[PDB]
Amino acid sequence: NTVTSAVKTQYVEIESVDGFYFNTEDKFDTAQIKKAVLHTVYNEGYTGDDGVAVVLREYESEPVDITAELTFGDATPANTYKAVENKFDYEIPVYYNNATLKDAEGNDATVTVYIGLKGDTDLNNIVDGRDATATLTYYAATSTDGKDATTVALSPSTLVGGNPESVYDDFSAFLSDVKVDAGKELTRFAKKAERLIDGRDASSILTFYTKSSVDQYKDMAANEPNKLWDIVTGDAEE
């Protein structure tokens, strides 16, 4: 008696890719979200005189592409980063109209990001001379006849485990590439093989470590590493 339709449940299906970030960055990149489709399930029915609901029909409306509307809300690399041994990945919930969404299995829809310290080649949450040596060692190996990014692993981390194809080696290369000639036109999405990890990256990491180890720059390294990086790479002076 008196049939009506109503939304029963709503979920999103998202295609997304990994994103790499420095702990100092203030913004995740929505470019990680390739496609997002919103599904809305309806029930059509009525309530009987006895007050009992009767569902006559279950269906969905036309799914809606909401890809461009998704944000990461207030989450940022800087406010998400936590140094945990052998753990660098995070699931960042997406927002649509200022609210989270459920995926097809009823869980909050999230995108994977990795966040680390610039310079931390060996992925141990510390920037020191070991990172400089690892970076130099990779350059020396890949400058050897018969060897390249695809046959040589950069990071000594157990997360890479000598595997030149590990996503963590891409992440290590991202962290180690402290001297980037191309600047911002080489995006955070570059793979290890698409980067130049060389002796210049290695010496910059060493100088960051040495400067962090003296009274003048100790606090700068700890509190605003970005200003120290600029100094050691020449992108700023003094």
Binding site: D122, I126, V127, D128, G129, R130, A132, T133, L136, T137, Y139, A140, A141, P156, G199, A202, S203, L206, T207, Y209, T210, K211, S212, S213, V214, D215, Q216, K218, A221, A222
Partner: protein, 209 residues
């Protein structure tokens, strides 16, 4: 019973507290020797520039990555290299293509890296220090190699892979390979200077009198 401090030097070295902390079983046991220059008279020493060497032994082809602190008596004046650095690499680091001295007041932090275990024995670093014009018989100007650590980073002496043996070698270096408050010098001059945590010195014999 009384507490004694050096004239113009502080003990910045910290307790080596990384696991493993005991380097007694390390396959490689590196030792760092620091110049001990003794002048016979004040006149002989006053205004002299002394080459202070930091010389490692026992580690030929067994290390790759190093970083440690050097400090000296504040009364000494460092003579910087042509680049302004307080220290200059020596033959021990000839095969290490990363080497960097970073000025740190009455001291310097010195670090190296290599694409394999190319660290060698011999002089790692030299620092030129000038004796003050008013030096006196009996004076001792201590020179200290110190281990420092904080949650962000610490000093290093390990192999290219930073293996288990590398970490043992590192514990040995800092706990037995240099002097510190936990491994004090018994050198008479350092005892006199109240700086047994230090490692080398420029000293002037006491008069008669």
């Amino acid at each position: 019973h009384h507490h004694h401090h050096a004239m113009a030097l502080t003990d910045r070295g910290m307790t080596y507290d990384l696991d493993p902390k005991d380097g007694s079983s390390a396959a490689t046991k590196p030792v760092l020797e620091v110049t001990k220059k003794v002048f016979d008279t004040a006149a002989d020493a006053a205004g002299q520039t002394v080459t202070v060497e930091f010389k490692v032994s026992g580690a030929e082809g067994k290390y790759a990555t190093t970083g440690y602190h050097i400090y000296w008596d504040e009364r000494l004046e460092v003579v910087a290299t042509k680049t302004g650095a307080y220290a200059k690499k020596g033959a021990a680091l000839e095969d290490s293509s990363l080497a960097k001295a970073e000025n740190n007041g009455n001291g310097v932090f010195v670090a190296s890296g290599a694409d394999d275990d190319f660290g060698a024995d011999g002089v790692m670093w030299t620092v030129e220090l000038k004796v003050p014009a008013d030096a006196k018989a009996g004076d001792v100007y201590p020179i200290d190699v110190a281990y420092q650590w904080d949650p962000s980073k610490g000093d290093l002496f390990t192999d290219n892979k930073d293996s288990a043996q590398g970490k043992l070698m590192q514990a040995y270096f800092f706990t037995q390979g240099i002097k510190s408050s936990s491994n004090p010098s018994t050198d008479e001059y350092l005892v006199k200077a109240n700086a047994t945590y230090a490692d080398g010195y420029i000293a002037i014999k006491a008069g008669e009198p």
